[PDB]
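Narrative progress, year one. The postdoctoral researcher (J.K.) led the effort to move from monomer predictions toward full complexes, under supervision of the PI. The following entry was the first complex the group processed end to end, covering 358 residues in total.
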Amino acid sequence: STRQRIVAAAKEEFARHGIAGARVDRIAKQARTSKERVYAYFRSKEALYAHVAERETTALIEATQLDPADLPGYAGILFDHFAARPDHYRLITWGRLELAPLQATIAGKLDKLRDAQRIGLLDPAWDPVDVLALINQIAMTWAGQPEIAAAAADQAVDPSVTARRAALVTAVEHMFPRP
Amino acid sequence: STRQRIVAAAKEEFARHGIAGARVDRIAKQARTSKERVYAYFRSKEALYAHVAERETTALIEATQLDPADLPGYAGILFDHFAARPDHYRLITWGRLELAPLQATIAGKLDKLRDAQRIGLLDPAWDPVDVLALINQIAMTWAGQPEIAAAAADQAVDPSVTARRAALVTAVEHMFPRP
């Protein structure tokens, strides 16, 4: 399709250059279309970003059903997602810095954790707020630490990516031990 | 001084707008000096960034003596630092995305952890590489999760920042339990 082609190309251009840095020129040239066409679907470079972000977020939220009874498995899930889509990570990070719905699913997950605690599945001492934030952080550990990720090169006993995954899942297991 | 004034003003402008987005205009205007003066100390907008980043990194490294025998205390240390300097965080993040010595201190800390393991102070099963990366991640949890940080507003039982700190330190305690 053509909306799709613009979107796919906008994804790759936003991850690279961010919003201010992205060019509709390049995007249309890459999407095999014209500037005028792009602006029929989307009002503005910034409207286009918004659309892409939404689309990305929703993709994520759906890939990311939270299981309160398996938090380390949850972390592996997020790990996998960004292992797969390195540039989703770039693309939202640009947005946090450049700008500074989702809130809904968060409010929902905090309720899901409140529930886990009530049915005795997660230490009642933790604040849900802290549990959610933390697990999200740890999961984007390798996205979020590129400098160490560089050293990880041949400083790691087992370079295998799924070794990174094991550690991470094991770490989350240590924080909130499954019942 | 005048170098200092340029640097202080460059810090605040890089955190805001990043490199491509920062203006030497604004920086000199803010540092109570001129464009020509700025360019006497520094070759280029990008040279100026580099300088500021270095200066920031070194500030950090020094504030961040790693104690392998108190990793959760270590995490509190990093937490504190970025709690204090929100814009150090913005400023290096801009750099990761816009560009993409420190390596030295990392190679050093991985050795420090290798040592901890050998003298029986940190489970020998972990890869140092994973331990270092993880702890760094978790520590910038609230910097790195602004969306949840927003919800944290009055979704937290105890809004107190040092409540965030406790959780984080406790979490790191759960991962690598002190001897």
